[PDB]
């Protein structure tokens, strides 16, 4: 795999952000304030990732038209405590913001994570945010080519609560006490060509609470019922057997995601979170208890050990946090995560990808450690320029204390090479 592009871009107001800012009439104060707090970051990310200028303008305009109205009310600041937060605490980011730009620094690709909300999201009128994410994906579908919602509707029927089930949770609040109430999250992959690849994520914990069925059973039955051809069957069964092995438990099945394209050629990812955050546990998961030890699998594990050591990952046993850590309060530990890529290929085991929660760790120190890894795998442009670009996104900030600028970092081994993505703070007040 060729090394990723990385151009420096530290401008407070990138040219494309200015050109659009001077031309847009907003019909909402919220949209206008969201734009100015997040558009500069997105514009820098696209310039540093070396997207074409035409494509930069397409995606910033798309951000303006499609995303801004889906962000709902602009976050409000507490005069006393100084905590900046929205009413709806999104399960997409530990800050609780409905927007996140992630950076695939292996390919120099940018993705827009969005949790579509309204003014009523979280209140008594819409306590689990059931409708708006669907409307968002329907709007995206009509606008963007190749977006097939077939997979979304099938998983939505099976993993999202109905009107009747919602009334039960409203009438009996004690049945679901978790602050993480997002059922559906979204992501748009921004390709270099101009094509946008849309993904949906389903968190069935509310459905699990009402129906009395575990998260594992909800996800597996969902995947199995949707998989008419039986393409995911072998890999799903061996994942179940690994989950069965770990049960006989810190390995928790959590959620899934699906690409929105041709159903017979679409792929599902199964996510689980692990509490024991150490390299011994990682090998066990990465190799399925030693069953998956082919050359590609082992070479990936060896590079994972370097990645782990370079970023100075602190090992420990971490549970799911008590609550959110909003922008303003002190930063923190949480469980690591793994997705398993049900790719429908010939392989017996689904492709694993590790996510480590770095929220709580010094962000400047993490990126310096990441630079060490960039030099290890020979990503010259990225090693030289990424750090200065990451920090440039947060001008008025103390990097000596800031531990919220990167929440998660992901690691996978694809096509004989490291695949790394940073999930970063995407908001400047």
Ligand X SMILES: O=C1N[C@@H](Cc2c[nH]c3ccccc23)C(=O)N2CCC[C@@H]12
Ligand Y SMILES: CC(C)=CCSP(=O)(O)OP(=O)(O)O
Alpha carbons 422 and 429: distance in angstroms, whole number: 21
Q: Which does 248 bind (CB under 5 to 8 A by kind): ligand Y, ligand X, Cl ion, none?
A: none
Out of 35, 51, 152, 408, the residue judged to bind ligand Y by CB under 6 A: 408
Residue 92 labeled ligand binder:
yes
- Answer yes or no: are the C-beta atoms of 342 and 267 closer than 8 Å: yes
According to the binding rule CB under 8 A, does residue 197 interact with its own copies? no
Considering Cα of 22, then 24, then 25, then 27, what sign does the dihedral take? negative
In DSSP notation, 108-153 reads TEEEEEE----TTBTSTTBTT--SHHHHHHHHHHHHSTT---HHHH
Interface positions, 160-219, toward ligand Y (CB under 6 A): 187, 199
Residue 235 labeled ligand binder:
no
Residues 53-92 vs ligand Y: string with x where CB under 6 A? ----------------------------------------
Residues 10-39 vs its own copies: string with x where CB under 8 A? -----xx-xxx-xxxx--------------
Q: Which does 355 bind (CB under 5 to 8 A by kind): ligand Y, Cl ion, its own copies, none?
A: ligand Y
Alpha carbons 283 and 303: distance in angstroms, whole number: 12
Residue 63 labeled ligand binder:
no
Angle between helices 53-62 and 29-48 (to 10 degrees): 150
- Answer yes or no: are the C-beta atoms of 109 and 190 closer than 8 Å: yes
Alpha carbons 184 and 274: distance in angstroms, whole number: 21
According to the binding rule CB under 8 A, does residue 309 interact with its own copies? no
Residue 136 labeled ligand binder:
no
According to the binding rule CB under 6 A, does residue 420 interact with ligand Y? no
Task: Using CB atoms within 10 Å of the CB of residue 323, give its burial: 0 to 12 exposed, 13 to 18 middle, 19+ buried.
Answer: exposed
Out of 33, 36, 58, 134, the residue judged to bind its own copies by CB under 8 A: 58
Between residues 172 and 319, which has the closer beta carbon with respect to ligand Y?
Answer: 319
Residue 100 labeled ligand binder:
yes
Between residues 39 and 222, which has the closer beta carbon with respect to Cl ion?
Answer: 222
Between residues 41 and 185, which has the closer beta carbon with respect to ligand X?
Answer: 185
Residues 61-100 vs its own copies: string with x where CB under 8 A? xx-xxx----------------------------------
According to the binding rule CB under 8 A, does residue 193 interact with its own copies? no
Between residues 74 and 339, which has the closer beta carbon with respect to ligand Y?
Answer: 339
Strand residue runs (E) in 275-343? 276-277, 316-317, 336-342
H or E, element range at 423: strand 417-424
| Other C-beta atoms lying within 10 Å of the C-beta of residue 173 | 9
Residue 2, both tokens = 């060729």
**Residues whose CB is less than 8 angstroms from the CB of residue 117 and which lie 6 or more positions away in sequence, other chains included:** 70, 71, 72, 86, 88, 90, 98, 129, 132
Q: Which does 92 bind (CB under 5 to 8 A by kind): ligand X, ligand Y, its own copies, none?
A: ligand X
According to the binding rule CB under 6 A, does residue 337 interact with ligand Y? yes
Interface positions, 128-157, toward its own copies (CB under 8 A): 139, 143-144
Instruction: Report in angstroms how near the CB of residue 132 gets to its own copies at its nearest.
Output: 15
Give rounded-to-5 percent helix, strand, coil for the chain: 40, 20, 40
Residue 163 labeled ligand binder:
no
Residues that bind ligand X (CB under 6 A): 91-94, 100, 113, 185, 187, 201, 408, 423
Counting residues that bind Cl ion (by CB under 5 A) gives 4
- Collapsing DSSP to helix, strand or coil, 418 comes out as strand
Q: How far is CA 69 from the centre of its chain?
A: 20
According to the binding rule CB under 8 A, does residue 119 interact with its own copies? no
Residue 153 labeled ligand binder:
no
Residue ranges that bind ligand Y, judged by CB under 6 A: 102, 111, 187, 199, 337, 355, 408, 410, 421, 423
Annotated binding site for brevianamide F: 92, 100, 203
Chain residues that interact with its own copies, rule: CB under 8 A:
15-16, 18-20, 22-25, 53-55, 57-59, 61-62, 64-66, 139, 143-144, 194
């Amino acid at each position: 795999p060729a090394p990723p592009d990385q151009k420096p871009c530290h401008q407070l107001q990138p040219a494309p952000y200015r050109a659009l800012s001077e031309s847009i009439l907003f019909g909402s104060v919220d949209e206008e304030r969201w734009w100015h707090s997040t558009a500069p970051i997105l514009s820098r990310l696209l310039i540093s990732s070396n997207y074409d200028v035409d494509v930069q303008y397409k995606y910033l305009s798309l951000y303006r038209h499609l995303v801004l109205p889906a962000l709902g009310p602009y976050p409000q600041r507490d005069p006393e405590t100084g905590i900046i937060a929205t009413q709806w605490r999104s399960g997409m980011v530990l800050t609780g913001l409905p927007i996140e730009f992630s950076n695939n620094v292996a390919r120099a690709l940018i993705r827009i994570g969005v949790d579509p909300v309204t003014a009523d999201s979280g209140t008594a009128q819409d306590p689990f945010n059931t409708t708006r994410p669907k409307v968002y994906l329907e709007t995206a579908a009509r606008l963007l080519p190749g977006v097939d919602l077939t997979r979304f509707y099938e998983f939505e029927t099976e993993l999202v609560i109905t009107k009747a089930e919602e009334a039960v949770l409203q009438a009996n609040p004690d049945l679901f006490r978790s602050p993480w109430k997002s059922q559906i999250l979204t992501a748009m992959d921004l390709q270099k060509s101009g094509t946008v690849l849309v993904k949906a994520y389903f968190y069935p914990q509310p459905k699990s609470a009402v129906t009395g069925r575990s998260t594992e059973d909800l996800l597996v039955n969902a995947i199995r019922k949707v998989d008419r051809e039986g393409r995911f069957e072998t890999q799903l069964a061996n994942l179940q057997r690994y989950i069965e092995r770990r049960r006989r438990c810190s390995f928790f099945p959590h959620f899934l995601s699906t690409d929105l394209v041709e159903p017979g050629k679409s792929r599902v990812k199964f996510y689980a979170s692990e509490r024991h955050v150490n390299l011994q546990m990682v090998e066990d998961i990465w190799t399925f208890g030693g069953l998956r030890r082919d050359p590609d699998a082992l070479r990936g594990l060896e590079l994972l050990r370097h990645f782990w050591a370079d970023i100075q990952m602190r090992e420990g046993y971490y549970t799911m946090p008590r609550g959110f850590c909003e922008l303003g309060k002190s930063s923190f530990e949480a469980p690591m995560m793994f997705h398993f890529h049900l790719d429908g290929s010939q392989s017996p085991f689904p492709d694993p990808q590790m996510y480590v929660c770095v929220f709580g760790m010094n962000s400047r120190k993490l990126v310096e450690g990441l630079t060490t890894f960039y030099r290890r795998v020979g990503w010259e442009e990225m090693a030289s320029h990424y750090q200065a670009n990451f920090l440039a996104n947060y001008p008025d900030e103390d990097f000596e204390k800031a531990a919220h600028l990167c929440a998660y970092v992901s690691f996978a081994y694809k096509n004989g090479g490291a695949y790394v993505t940073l999930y970063n703070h995407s908001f400047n007040p």
